From Swiss-Prot, chain A:
Family: Belongs to the outer membrane factor (OMF) (TC 1.B.17) family.
Topology of the protein relative to the lipid bilayer: Lipid-anchor
GO CC, one annotated term: membrane
Protein name, as recorded: Outer membrane protein OprJ
One GO molecular-function entry: efflux transmembrane transporter activity
Pfam assignment, any one: OEP
Domain of life: Bacteria
The species this protein was found in: Pseudomonas aeruginosa (strain ATCC 15692 / DSM 22644 / CIP 104116 / JCM 14847 / LMG 12228 / 1C / PRS 101 / PAO1)
Residues linked to a lipid group, N-palmitoyl cysteine type: C1
A biological-process GO annotation: response to antibiotic
Xref: SUPFAM superfamilies: Outer membrane efflux proteins (OEP) (SSF56954)
Function statement: Channel-forming component of a multidrug resistance efflux pump.
Gene3D superfamilies: Outer membrane efflux proteins (OEP)
Name of the encoding gene: oprJ
Main location: membrane
Swiss-Prot record, chain B:
Family of this protein: Belongs to the outer membrane factor (OMF) (TC 1.B.17) family.
Designated name of the protein: Outer membrane protein OprJ
Gene name linked to the record: oprJ
Domain of life: Bacteria
Chain spans, region Disordered: 75-94
Organism: Pseudomonas aeruginosa (strain ATCC 15692 / DSM 22644 / CIP 104116 / JCM 14847 / LMG 12228 / 1C / PRS 101 / PAO1)
Amino acid sequence: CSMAPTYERPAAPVADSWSLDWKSFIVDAELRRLVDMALDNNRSLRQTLLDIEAARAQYRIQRADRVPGLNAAATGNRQRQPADLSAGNRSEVASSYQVGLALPEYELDLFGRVKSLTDAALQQYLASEEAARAARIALVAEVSQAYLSYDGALRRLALTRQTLVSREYSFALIDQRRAAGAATALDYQEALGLVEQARAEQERNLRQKQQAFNALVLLLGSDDAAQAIPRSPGQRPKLLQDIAPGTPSELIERRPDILAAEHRLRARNADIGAARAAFFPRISLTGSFGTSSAEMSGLFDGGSRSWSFLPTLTLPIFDGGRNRANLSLAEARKDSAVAAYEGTIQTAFREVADALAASDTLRREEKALRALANSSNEALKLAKARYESGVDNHLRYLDAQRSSFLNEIAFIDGSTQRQIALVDLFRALG
Amino acid sequence: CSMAPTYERPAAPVADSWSGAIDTLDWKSFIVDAELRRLVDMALDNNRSLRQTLLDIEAARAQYRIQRADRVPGLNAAATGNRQRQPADLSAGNRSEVASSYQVGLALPEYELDLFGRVKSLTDAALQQYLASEEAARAARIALVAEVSQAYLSYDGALRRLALTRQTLVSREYSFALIDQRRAAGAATALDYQEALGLVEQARAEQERNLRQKQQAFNALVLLLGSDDAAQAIPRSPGQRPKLLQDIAPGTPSELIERRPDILAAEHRLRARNADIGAARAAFFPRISLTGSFGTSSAEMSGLFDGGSRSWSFLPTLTLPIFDGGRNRANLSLAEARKDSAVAAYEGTIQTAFREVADALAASDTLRREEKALRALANSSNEALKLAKARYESGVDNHLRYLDAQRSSFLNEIAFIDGSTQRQIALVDLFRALG
Amino acid sequence: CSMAPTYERPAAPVADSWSGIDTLDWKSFIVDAELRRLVDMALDNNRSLRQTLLDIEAARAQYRIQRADRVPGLNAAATGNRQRQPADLSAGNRSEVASSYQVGLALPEYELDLFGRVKSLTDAALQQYLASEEAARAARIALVAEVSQAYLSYDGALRRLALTRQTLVSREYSFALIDQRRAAGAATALDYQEALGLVEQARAEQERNLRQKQQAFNALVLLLGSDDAAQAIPRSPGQRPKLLQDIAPGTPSELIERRPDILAAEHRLRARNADIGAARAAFFPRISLTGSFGTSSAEMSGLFDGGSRSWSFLPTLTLPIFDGGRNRANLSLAEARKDSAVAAYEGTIQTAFREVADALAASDTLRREEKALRALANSSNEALKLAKARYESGVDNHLRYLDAQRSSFLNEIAFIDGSTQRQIALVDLFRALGGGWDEGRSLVVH
């Protein structure tokens, strides 16, 4: 028999609608190379891989209880008792030695208490493997995001460097106009403030670059992970621009997070089955089988055979209210596993909805960012010539140089924000 | 005879009052917005994080009942058989004897008589942990009331910014069409068209930003509500700005000590450790263990229920340790160290509550003044843009004044929404911090 | 005789250098006398530190508990047993009600660890408390750093406030000139609105700076964790730089030996190497012995009497031929757990490398960024004076003056932010490095 209830999956509390391989997804040959390195060597994932080895050993520990064992023991008992207590009526020293095999307390499994406990340890083992899958998904997504940011930094640094040489050469022209006398002093300072902006932004971009590089070196986790990353990155898109979201129902059966959570609920359901079997009578066997003697010299002799066999049944009648508390505790734990499962679904529903809302917005933004960057860069060139001729003051040209630079960086930003939100979608689906 | 120390509440390590510029009110009294109350009620009834915290109250009660069950004697029905081959030298018969012994009846598992208050201490400890969980749930409740209000205002802000960004986009494209017709004729220069073009392209990108924000804020607000019926519950119209009471009197910190759940839970977790000392104390003293059986027994099975076959056993056992390996002392050291850690915790949560209320107080009077400044700033920019258009229509001034005046009128109007939003979120933070 | 394998330090999983502290302690590192006083104050009365210190005294106790199991105990005891039995079961062949009593010293359940399982469990608990020490060293260094940062943020906010107020008063004077000119008809209504805008920007900025100051203050009060901490925080900026600007990082091989995080993990690893020795010891047989000494009698009166002296002595040996695969599974679990601790030890060093790396990169780039930001600041301030003269002549429209005022104020804030952020990066570097040699022995006070 087994008192564990029948497991029914709780109805997905999310709405029915929203408003596949990692190598297949990650097209870039080097990024995929990097993810393979990280997947092989990342130490946080390695801990989660050894978590499942522990969880397997716990099931193996519980499985051991279902089978009866066999132990070779030797037990001497020597004691001086009073005259008063013994049948002899004169105070005596009694000795008794035993050797041979013995059966440690073995539970007959009529109500499936141990069966149920062994089942729970399986479900947490399986929930550990689903957690290791979730971490694997999370690692690949984190390695990619860190490569996209590293790339995005290098695009900013390259832009800033071409912006710096432009403003440095453009400043040299304004300096010698004042040395002549033709240049305003305000114009000279406004051109200087431009050059320093570029130097300060280059420092910011060098920081972002190397902090992204270090984060990558960590996530790879090799001693040679600094060598493995290319200093000059391939500028082609690294991932599939479009992914179909699918039904939320498919997500529930697909995503490791969900599978880890349902398996926890199954373990908790098995736990109920153990609480129920405690109310029912426990039966157990103890056994000893070997050779008993009165002296050390009489144990390796003929006809010294001896055995003990002890079956015992026991049924709790009165507790302090313990078994019903154990039942109430296992049920509360189960109800939490259900709420956990429901909440884990609802979360995953929100994480993909966010990734879709982002991806829809970011495709539509990046077109506005490019066209503004082109509108700014042409307005820069018109305003350049308007100052350079001498029609308008330096301010318009100055303001256009700021706007050009801001808009061109803000594009590099929103392009990288589009590709990262794409991998966030691949993670959130699973 | 409970050996737990007499519990005195640790003195509060915070200021006797709050620095710079009624708190008996209900959260429904605090939240004037009837829509927001409906959303928060739905969150209260359906959220899963709160559900999980309420359910480990249920766990904590059961754990108390398992310790409370240890206090009272129990009774098992039992049936035990024993068979054994005893050899001649140990046996009374002087020949190899096989003896069986089947017995059946009621039995008493090892019962500890609580003279020294050991088990009562453990039971008081488990009770206190249950009362802590009760307060931990009252906290989780308040946390979620705040999180819903913060999420709903953040969402209300995101659509209110979207609403200005689209109206600005329309007037943006309309003013570009006028410069497009002027440039098509050949009067207006290539730059005045290009500057108006880029600026329309910029306002396109900002609308997308605000769209994503409201969608992400919608999603986060849906999860909080945690219901299948959630998307229907949320308004797409922005409610009237006074969604909560603007004026609250925080009172002293000493009033906060008795009100705020986090603290009261931490106090109960302290009381739990005072008890645990009483258990470690009592373990030094003797332990009186009682077992007993009662019913029938025999050598053969058929004569179990037989006349004059009554067989019982009554075993009291007393044990007191002279020496171990300093374990009982090591166990009292542990319990005293954990008591102290609970005092530090209790005090550490009060200090933390202090910071939180103090931040909320500072934020709320700075954002009041900042809001007035930002509203006045945006209005000067808005009228400065009116005057920059007059200068452009007259032709007396360049496009660049008219460009700066609409960038800065747009940024200042965005910043005012952010500033108005941030203030009322701080009133929620002040409600959250006071408990 | 402990059968656990010989402990060997895992080779460092990162390169031998950083692409381009022993002597330095926190009191040497922090130059400002006022900040030193703040750090001292938090170290005494910080409650999160206090908790991690009491976690050591708890871990010591649990080491003392496992030690206890290693030596034999002895205890006094009084055992009564009254029992009825029928004739068919009694050896006397009659309705017998026999009683017995015992009083005296009992030795319970002592285990001779010939194969050494209990010593290994004692080693595990020893290392756990040695990790608990290192853990609190980290938490203390982290406290130093956190108070330092919170003060540096506090300092910075007072500077932004000072500027904002200076800026603000200039804007109030400038506007009063234009309010008069627009009253006279000498300035345009658009110039008057722009000037009013400038005033409000700085007014709103004042309020932002005040919150920033007060929240950083409230954080400091918390970290100090004292009733009288608020009085101990300086109300005015520290005149000069408050830390040493140039810290030499040393190798990563040195960081392994110094940094608390790494050593905490190392002790935990060594604790799991012991738990393997305990699982290996489970395969060999368990020798348990029990004994008694005292007086026993049939009736309660006869207890303490001549010829009542009774003793008990029973040693058991227990070897399992079959388990259920449990002793194998325990060993597999002990190997798994040890392997996770080794990976944790590696991951800690790797994570320390990233934090150090990020911190030097931050320090060096912010050095140069600050110089550039200083150069940009006073460029925009000189151009402010020129644009002011150019506007006041009537030569230019207001926009050039207005834009210079905006740019100067925004660049001067940006310098304060950048400068304070460099100092916060110097603190982040100190933490990531993890202090000099054996920075703290506040931990071992018992």
